[PDB]
Design a protein around this nucleic acid. Structure first.
Ligand SMILES: [Zn+2]
Ligand SMILES: [Zn+2]
Ligand SMILES: [Zn+2]
Ligand SMILES: [Zn+2]
Ligand SMILES: [Zn+2]
Ligand SMILES: [Zn+2]
Ligand SMILES: [Zn+2]
Ligand SMILES: [Zn+2]
Ligand SMILES: [Zn+2]
Lengths: 129, 132
DNA sequence: CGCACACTCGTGACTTCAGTCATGAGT
DNA sequence: TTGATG
DNA sequence: CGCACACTCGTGACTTCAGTCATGAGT
DNA sequence: TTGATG
């Protein structure tokens, strides 16, 4: 069940969420579908496994499975920074409501995720011991 | 409960587990107590929050809470590397069965942990999207 | 209102060479 | 050009 | 015996200046 | 000097 690398055994999932700058509801129709392809492209280029992806009008959800060497600020920069660049290039109409050089809110929300709760894991540990 | 920093909001918990080199059963009594003290000191020096810690004779568990800037290999090196150095100095008797310069198995096991299950989070997000 | 994850200004790093990440401060 | 995502 | 998260040899980074982290490879 | 933790 555990993944394996040279110096470690792991199971790492993160739920990442970020919003459109000014909270504009622009991720719809063609722009939303284009973003899904662009994020898939960026994730494949960076060797990041995307478990699920949801694009809502003003925010994006990604559930990622990572190795211990894939640090959070690095994958968030790659996903948000490269997608904003590619999106403005592929969908220049985005510049009509976002002309300030930003597609994204500069903050992000990140959560570690597990199938069992921290409380259940704690109980399992005491039990094993 | 959701923490905040300059560019992010987060809740990051990990379950880290590692074993003694050769699987020797040496973490007992005062040796185990000293290890716990040393690990808490290292965690404090590094701004890592220790949620729980369990020391068994041949392995150690840590449930940690961290910021998005605390990368896994860095905190594992800080915890395992400095504790091995400090444990051998504080308990020289460890050298009787561990004379090769290693207190620890060179591998570590690490898992992300959430307060709620993945399923509960997924169901909550869907409810949020389905609202009004 | 008064911020601040969000708004703005500022710094530096580094890809996407633009627009994020890192980051303090003001509003 | 801001007002809320988990 | 081969294997590898675990044993061993090897490389480089960086604190803990030892003994981990990064890392490939042979058993 | 190893034999299994999550
Ligand atoms: Zn594409
Ligand atoms: Zn940012
Ligand atoms: Zn245990
Ligand atoms: Zn102390
Ligand atoms: Zn190692
Ligand atoms: Zn949502
Ligand atoms: Zn502030
Ligand atoms: Zn307003
Ligand atoms: Zn191998």
């Amino acid at each position: 069940e555990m993944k394996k690398g040279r110096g470690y055994v792991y199971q790492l999932e993160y739920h990442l969420i970020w919003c459109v700058k000014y909270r504009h509801q622009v991720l719809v129709g063609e722009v939303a579908d284009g973003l899904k392809d662009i994020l898939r492209d960026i994730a494949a280029q960076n060797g990041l496994e995307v478990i699920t992806m949801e694009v809502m009008p003003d925010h994006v959800h990604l559930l990622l499975s990572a190795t211990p060497q894939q640090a959070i600020p690095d994958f968030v920069k790659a996903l948000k920074g490269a997608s904003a660049r590619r999106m403005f290039v592929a969908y220049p109409q985005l510049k009509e409501k976002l002309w300030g050089g930003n597609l994204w809110n500069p903050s992000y929300c990140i959560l570690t995720v597990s199938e069992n709760t921290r409380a259940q894991i704690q109980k399992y540990i005491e039990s094993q011991h």
